[PDB]
């Protein structure tokens, strides 16, 4: 996996030394090319994980997330063009350095072969995200945003540190393959449930579940437009990879211990959907819908079902794409209006004919309608949860009952109706935006046509 | 006065000073160049030749292989009537019964 | 009144973030507000000497 990591690491001096205005161009081009190299990794041999070295390995679970991150890096890269055109050249290169280091640490996490290295790079993501959120933020509460995000993630992570060093001392190794192959039944001992809690709560923290979901709403709102999509897109899914890999040792104790959090997700995905009918900010709207989708993926994980795993694996990719998709639109409207109020500007279709079209398929993908991979990822979870506990379909039906009520509500109160008469600075949509949502939505259906790749590693 | 500040600057739009621009930068020629590069691999070979790459990837989990190699097993076992499946995958005989 | 405000913006933020931050509040000013008199510091050394010596009986 040096093939894709080394280009990213060595790309850094290019941005840090190139000319004051070619840095955007060169970073964009080389990001598209290392993403090109990345999609060659979609190959997965039989059931064997694609091994590369003693420290780096990948599989069908990893590959979609890897090529995801490589595909995004250009997206916030050229989304940053508007918001960073007026700041100093050295700060521009530093911002690009932050993004590149973030992507590097992501592809390091996802290819990790041994647990504690995955953990080191798992916490290595906060530093770039914290820097991006705090420095290049816009409003005042961004400082408390960084505090909440950093402290929440750490307070989750440290128990996982103690648990992992304990696993290494006891079992003998933390390599993924061996602990899957040398797995043993985690008994119902009173130390074992705290073992499980330490190995689970860390990932649950950066997978906002009901109750412990304040950092995302209070950080994504005023995070920089480029950063916000990165938080909402990937770092909620590295935790999902964490569950995907750590649940191989947490059985069979997961059978009955998962129940408190399990239901805390289903009712949770209703409340964060129920909260989602009433938001004064569009960014908070997308954040709460995202929280609902991650509660869905959480209950997908905790059942331990191959169909649940497939629905999850599809759901991380689908939700990340759609969430960043909507966040781009929120950025565009805010930047034109220099505010983030919900009902400030309705009826934008009367001014930007193609922008509300983008809004339309963005919400439609948020709807999870067939045959989009959002629907198929949800549907596998529907089937798994039904086979789990019969009635679960009632609560999850309430979720596929609220999702569109808020998604299309956002359309009717942003794009449909008529423009508010006071605002008059809304110019024609620049090709940068509509181009970026084009590169966002078209591959969303392209890989929908080929769902095997993102379907899951249990295929 | 309470502080010596520069007031909030007006957020210029590129089209107003420079029509035919692209919301990409101030100098038009690199506006064009950024257009070409993003409308390159972004929508070009990464998006399309990449689509063929993922679509025309080698055997996925040997499913295309596992398809062909299983009708032969089916035929072999229906020849003697033993069905396409079995109750046990691992063989009872080689594994001992405890007590 | 139940999903928003009272639950998200009142309750959950009160329990984990604000209550723990208030604990650190109340225990940072009772920990780091000593006047600077050598006496009371030295009697803090004093009672610690016996608590280490006989009360806990570290040596035993």
């Amino acid at each position: 996996m040096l093939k894709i990591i080394i280009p990213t690491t060595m790309l850094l001096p290019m941005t840090w030394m190139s000319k004051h205005n070619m840095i955007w161009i060169n970073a964009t081009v080389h990001s598209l090319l290392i993403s090109l190299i990345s999609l060659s990794l979609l190959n997965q041999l039989g059931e064997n994980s694609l091994n590369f070295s003693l420290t780096f390995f990948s599989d069908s679970l990893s590959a979609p997330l890897l090529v995801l991150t490589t595909w995004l890096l250009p997206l916030m890269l050229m989304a940053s063009q508007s918001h960073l055109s007026k700041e100093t050249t050295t700060r521009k290169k530093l911002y690009i350095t932050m993004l590149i280091l973030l992507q590097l640490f992501l592809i390091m996490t996802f290819t990790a072969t041994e647990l504690i290295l995955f953990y080191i790079l798992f916490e290595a993501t906060l530093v770039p995200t914290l820097i991006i959120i705090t420095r290049w933020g816009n409003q005042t509460e961004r400082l408390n945003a960084g505090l909440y995000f950093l402290f929440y993630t750490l307070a989750g992570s440290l128990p996982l540190l103690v648990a992992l060093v304990y696993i290494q001392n006891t079992t003998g190794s933390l390599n993924f393959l061996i602990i899957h192959y040398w797995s043993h039944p985690l008994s119902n001992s009173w130390s074992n449930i705290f073992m499980w809690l330490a190995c689970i709560m860390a990932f649950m923290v950066k997978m906002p579940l009901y109750g412990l979901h304040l950092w995302l709403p209070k950080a994504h709102v005023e995070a920089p437009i480029a950063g916000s999509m990165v938080l909402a897109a990937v770092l909620l899914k590295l935790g999902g990879y964490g569950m995907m890999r750590i649940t191989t040792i947490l059985n069979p104790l997961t059978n009955y211990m998962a129940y408190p959090f399990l239901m805390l997700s289903m009712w949770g995905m209703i409340m964060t959907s129920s909260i989602c009918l009433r938001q004064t900010d569009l960014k908070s709207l997308i954040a709460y819908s995202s929280v609902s989708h991650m509660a869905l993926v959480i209950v997908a994980i905790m059942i331990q079902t191959p169909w649940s795993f497939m629905g999850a694996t599809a759901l991380m990719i689908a939700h990340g794409l759609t969430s960043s998709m909507l966040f781009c639109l929120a950025n565009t409207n805010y930047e034109r209006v220099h505010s983030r109020t919900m009902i400030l500007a309705r009826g934008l279709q009367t001014l930007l004919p193609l922008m509300a079209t983008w809004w339309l398929m963005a919400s439609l993908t948020n709807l999870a309608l067939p045959p989009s991979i959002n629907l198929i990822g949800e549907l596998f979870i529907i089937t798994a949860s039904f086979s789990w506990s019969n009635i679960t379909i009632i609560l999850m039906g309430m979720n596929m009952m609220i999702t569109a009520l808020y998604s299309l509500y956002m359309l009717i109160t942003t794009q449909r109706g008529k423009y508010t008469h006071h605002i008059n600075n809304i110019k024609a949509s620049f090709t940068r935006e509509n181009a970026l949502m084009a590169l966002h939505i078209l591959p969303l259906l392209l890989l929908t046509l080929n769902p095997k790749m993102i379907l899951g590693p249990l295929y | 006065i309470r502080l010596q500040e520069d007031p909030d600057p007006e957020d210029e739009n590129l089209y107003e000073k420079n029509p035919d621009s692209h919301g990409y930068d101030k100098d038009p020629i690199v506006d064009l160049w950024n257009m070409r590069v993003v409308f390159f691999f972004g929508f070009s070979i990464v998006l399309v030749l990449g689509s063929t790459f993922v679509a025309y990837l080698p055997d996925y989990r040997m499913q295309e292989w596992a398809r062909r190699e299983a009708e032969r097993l089916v035929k072999y076992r229906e020849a003697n009537g033993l069905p396409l499946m079995e109750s046990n995958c691992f063989d009872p005989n080689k594994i001992q019964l405890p007590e | 009144k139940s999903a928003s405000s009272l639950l998200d913006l009142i309750w959950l933020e009160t329990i984990l973030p604000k209550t723990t931050s208030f604990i650190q509040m109340k225990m940072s000013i009772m920990v780091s507000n000593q006047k600077g008199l050598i006496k009371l510091y030295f009697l803090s050394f004093l009672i610690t000497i016996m608590i280490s010596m006989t009360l806990f009986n570290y040596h035993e």
Binding site: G137, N138, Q139 | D8 | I29
Partner: peptide, 19 residues
């Protein structure tokens, strides 16, 4: 532009001890 700390935002620390 973004928001930078006002004079009051620096003032709240001030005061020897800020809590």
């Amino acid at each position: 532009r973004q928001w930078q700390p006002d004079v009051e935002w620096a003032e709240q620390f001030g005061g020897a001890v800020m809590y």
